[PDB]
Amino acid sequence: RLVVGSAVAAALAKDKQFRHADWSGDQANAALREAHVGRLAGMNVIRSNAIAPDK
C-alpha cells in the first residue's frame, strides 16, 4: 500500500516523466487531462489528506 499526500501528488502531476506524453508513453496524457497519476511503479497511488501532504 502506497499513500501520498497533496504535495506529493501535485509533484507527481508536475513531474516531466508523467506530464510529457512522449515521456509518459500514454496517448491519453492524464497529467494534462483530468488530474490523476494512476498506477506508479509496481503498485497503485492512494490520495489521502489525513497524512502530511509533503510525506
Binding site: 500500500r1 499513500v3 492512494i46 490520495r47 489521502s48 489528506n49 489525513a50 497524512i51
Partner: peptide
Amino acid sequence: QREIVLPGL
C-alpha cells in the same frame, strides 16, 4: 470535512 480512506488499509 475529511475523507475516510486510511481505515481499512
